[PDB]
Amino acid sequence: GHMGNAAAAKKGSEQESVKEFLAKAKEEFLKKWESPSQNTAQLDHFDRIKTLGTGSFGRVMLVKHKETGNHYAMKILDKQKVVKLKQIEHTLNEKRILQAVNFPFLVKLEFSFKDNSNLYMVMEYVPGGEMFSHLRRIGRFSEPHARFYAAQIVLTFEYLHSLDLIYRDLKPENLLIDQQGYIQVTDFGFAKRVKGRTWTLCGTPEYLAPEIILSKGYNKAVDWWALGVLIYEMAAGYPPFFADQPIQIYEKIVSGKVRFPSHFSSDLKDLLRNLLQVDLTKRFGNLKNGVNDIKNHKWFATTDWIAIYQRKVEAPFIPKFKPGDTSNFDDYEEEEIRVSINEKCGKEFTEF
């Protein structure tokens, strides 16, 4: 066989220890999921510094806590705009997930609160900015560098899926790099508690699994497809399926054909063919052996999963350290934060 007695016993023990960790982590998650934290700071505790990102319903700003001097990233959502754009459930769900999860590669919600006009989520500030910018600048990551990031996503999805959470938003734009070179996942606006199947068309074209495109009910295996897309794009510098228009992207995704750069190792191509598998009965992460088919793949043979979790592996890349430096985020026009004398949409946001 592939393993002698010592190696097989070690692997079996490791896999049983994962089950034990996940059972405890579920218990902790469910307590916070059923009794969420609310109203843990207020706006005048913070000085606003600068905008790190903007969207249709709000913005993320660097702020400084006046007493500690600590910097945070504050997501500000205009209650009236959230209602108008039909994002009440997504907004409440994102905050409920963030306050309940706990994992070293998931961003931490330090405070949350609301006022007459806005909802506020105060999260850790992650000064390395988005993986996206680093990837486009460097061009592509070497296989060991891509693997270091991929291993963190594998463990994060193993954790989230144990909680029956599907993520549905994986892409370099949604992965931040911290000062130690490790990944932080921040956006939970498309995540959903799903024990079985779900049906919403959501995600980003390049990262959509075929079953989403084909308007099927789908499950957590869409996240493993997305992992394949991410690994490919990290190692190649471009994603496996692209075109001028989304419809042409979708034709490629559903086709069952993927092509690889000549510098990809055979081990990498084998992993990617098993992740980017259209046939759900064959896709890694969706078989009887679950996440272990991925973690035990030859491409990950050098990965010490516990050392990654414990953050004891030396990262391949440390973003330039300039603690409130914003250099790894884009520049945006600074608009004011207005708070009305009258409470807006109170009933809709009671749970926030």
Binding site: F132, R136, D169, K171, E173, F190, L201, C202, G203, T204, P205, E206, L208, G237, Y238, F242, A243, D244, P246, R259, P261
Partner: peptide, 18 residues
């Protein structure tokens, strides 16, 4: 080349969700 095709796609910047 594939890289040139990627540039030609116009989808090298940050991608929006559907």
């Amino acid at each position: 080349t594939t890289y040139a095709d990627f540039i030609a796609s116009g989808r090298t910047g940050r991608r929006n969700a559907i």
